[PDB]
C-alpha cells in the first residue's frame, strides 16, 4: 500500500549512509585491484543467471564485498572466496530458496572446500555485524518506477541495466550513493527511450535536481557509451535476453542535452 513509501524512502535514504563502503579502499588494498573487482562482480552476475537468482541478490552481494574489503585486506587468491560467501549470505537473506553450499562450491570449480566457504560466511557476518538489509540501487529504482507516466517496461529494464553496469566498476561509482546512481540511471534510461527527463515528482521526493545529478550522470553516460567495448560483458549478455526487451541493443545517445 501507498501509505508507507515516503517513510521507507526517507529511511532507505538514512540507512544508505550507514551501510556505506570506504571510497578509497581498493587503494589501501595491497594485492587486489579495481579490475580484479570487476572480474569478480562480472562472475557474480553470471553465477546469478545460472541459478536464476534475483537481481537484488546480486546488488546485495556486491555491497557485502565492498564493506568487507573496507576493513579486511584480502589476497587475490582468497577474493573469490570472499565473493562466494557474499553471494551465499545475500542468497540466504533475499531468495525464497537459495542454492546449496555445494552449488556455491561448484560455481567456483572445487576451488574452495565447502567448509572454507561456510566459515567465511561467518567471518563476513562478523565484520558487518549482521547488517545485511543494505539499501541498493535496485531498491531505489523500484521505488521510483512508480512515478512513470505513462508506464513503460523498456525504461524499467534499461535503468536496471545501467545500474548493474555500475556494480562492475568502483572506479568512479563507489563515491555515489545508490539513491543518486539509481537517480542517474532512471534518467538516462528515460532519456534514452522516450526523450523525457527525470521528473519533477521525484525532484521533490528525493531533493534531486537534474543539475545535482549531473556529475554521476556524465560518468554513467560514458560507461553506457563504452559498454560494448568493456572488458566484462556478462551483464550485457544477460540484458540481451528478451526477458528485458533487449534494452542492451538500443543505441546510446551520444549526447545528453545538458
Amino acid at each position: 500500500v501507498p501509505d508507507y513509501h515516503e517513510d521507507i524512502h526517507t529511511y532507505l535514504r538514512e540507512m544508505e549512509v550507514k551501510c556505506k563502503p570506504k571510497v578509497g579502499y581498493m587503494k589501501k588494498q595491497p594485492d587486489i585491484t579495481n579490475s580484479m573487482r570487476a572480474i569478480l562482480v562480472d562472475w557474480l552476475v553470471e553465477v546469478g543467471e545460472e541459478y536464476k537468482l534475483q537481481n537484488e541478490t546480486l546488488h546485495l552481494a556486491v555491497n557485502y564485498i565492498d564493506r568487507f574489503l573496507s576493513s579486511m585486506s584480502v589476497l587475490r587468491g582468497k577474493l573469490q572466496l570472499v565473493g562466494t560467501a557474499a553471494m551465499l549470505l545475500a542468497s540466504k537473506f533475499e531468495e525464497i530458496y537459495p542454492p546449496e553450499v555445494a552449488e556455491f562450491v561448484y560455481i567456483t570449480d572445487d576451488t574452495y572446500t565447502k567448509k572454507q566457504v561456510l566459515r567465511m560466511e561467518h567471518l563476513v557476518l562478523k565484520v558487518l555485524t549482521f547488517d545485511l538489509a543494505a539499501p541498493t540501487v535496485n531498491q531505489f529504482l523500484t521505488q521510483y518506477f512508480l512515478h512513470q507516466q505513462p508506464a513503460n517496461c523498456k525504461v524499467e529494464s534499461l535503468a536496471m541495466f545501467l545500474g548493474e553496469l555500475s556494480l562492475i566498476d568502483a572506479d568512479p561509482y563507489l563515491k555515489y550513493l545508490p539513491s543518486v546512481i539509481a537517480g542517474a540511471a532512471f534518467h538516462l534510461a528515460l532519456y534514452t527511450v522516450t526523450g523525457q527527463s527525470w521528473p519533477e515528482s521525484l525532484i521533490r521526493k528525493t531533493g534531486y535536481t537534474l543539475e545535482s545529478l549531473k556529475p554521476c550522470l556524465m560518468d554513467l553516460h560514458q560507461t553506457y557509451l563504452k559498454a560494448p567495448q568493456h572488458a566484462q560483458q556478462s551483464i550485457r549478455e544477460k540484458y540481451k535476453n528478451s526477458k528485458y526487451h533487449g534494452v542492451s541493443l538500443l543505441n546510446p545517445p551520444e549526447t545528453l542535452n545538458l
Binding site: M36, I39, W43, R76, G77, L79, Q80, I107, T108, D109
Partner: peptide, 5 residues
C-alpha cells in the same frame, strides 16, 4: 571457474 588474477 577458478578466477586467476
Amino acid at each position: 571457474r577458478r578466477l586467476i588474477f
